[PDB]
Design a protein around this ligand. Sequence first.
Ligand SMILES: [Ca+2]
Ligand SMILES: [Ca+2]
Ligand SMILES: [Ca+2]
Ligand SMILES: [Cl-]
Ligand SMILES: [Cl-]
Ligand SMILES: [Cl-]
Ligand SMILES: [Cl-]
Lengths: 173, 173
Amino acid sequence: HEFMAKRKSDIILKSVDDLKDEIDYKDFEYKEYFNLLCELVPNNSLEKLEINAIDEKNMKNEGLVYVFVIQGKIFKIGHSITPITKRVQSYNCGKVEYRKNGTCSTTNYFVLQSLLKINKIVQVYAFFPEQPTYTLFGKTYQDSFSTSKRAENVILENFIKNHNKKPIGCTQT
Amino acid sequence: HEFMAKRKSDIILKSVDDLKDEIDYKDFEYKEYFNLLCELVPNNSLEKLEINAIDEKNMKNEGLVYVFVIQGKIFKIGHSITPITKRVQSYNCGKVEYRKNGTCSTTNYFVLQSLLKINKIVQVYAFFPEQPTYTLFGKTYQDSFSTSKRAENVILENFIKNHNKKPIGCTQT
DNA sequence: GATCT
DNA sequence: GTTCA
DNA sequence: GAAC
DNA sequence: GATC
Ligand SMILES: [Ca+2]
Ligand SMILES: [Ca+2]
Ligand SMILES: [Ca+2]
Ligand SMILES: [Cl-]
Ligand SMILES: [Cl-]
Ligand SMILES: [Cl-]
Ligand SMILES: [Cl-]
């Protein structure tokens, strides 16, 4: 690249040659816990990633660790409390315009733009950890959320039921 | 305000009168589950919030739901898998410069700037849910993380021990 | 399509 | 103080 | 909202 | 990274 990056997220990868020093997926010690869930297909015209479902039964499963692999090289390990389709939706927020707006995460910008430029199909490996049962206010939950996030959700919903709206500082609808 | 806001996070609150239709903390239905944790003190000169620790034994406790209260009014309900100190430092990322850079969340920007402009001490009430025990790869955990986030941390730490670095797409140190 | 947490 | 997820 |  |  030719500019002085102020930060790592501004250094967009340029080609699969930038992955030359990465670790092979074969050398991933936890790989027996992972299965090939889906693939990502870069759509440069529409500045987004499309999905080809592979492990169709798991496409709506939530709470996963994922590995993005390009030509056998590990590009990224991440996670989501949502299904993979929503995590990809989130990556599709990494558009140039939104980075300019300051409304996307630097992570989503870095990854979306890198994958678009590398322009290869990305294999997505996933592991879905078992979810514990937990209690909050004499009610039991089993899901992908942290207990604090779930507690907040119940409390905010109740608040809206009781008061007809969220607090002014809770911006999201 | 006078500009055409493109989004809700750009509408910074200007004074306590902007809270006049908010719900009083005393009418909060879950108030019996919450206890005063700390106060936040706006420091406009330094464009940040300071902390007055109250519930000292809980200042390093992780996994909470919080309520920000200003002159009796509920401004916001939120949560953190970290201690309140770290959530506050995250709010301290809501600086004008960082918003211009696009490197802070719109949430942190909206809240920090609103709290600085209102310029009142904020009472922080908190509830710490009980943490369930759970198993990953035959090891037991009991913490504030979702199972997917913990699983990814465990996997990534092992990845670093094996290959001495993180994947290139994992930007954070 | 776009922002919020 | 400042960016990443 | 989590992390450096 | 979660959400609308
Ligand atoms: Ca992750
Ligand atoms: Ca009124
Ligand atoms: Ca929250
Ligand atoms: Cl969570
Ligand atoms: Cl309520
Ligand atoms: Cl600061
Ligand atoms: Cl490994």
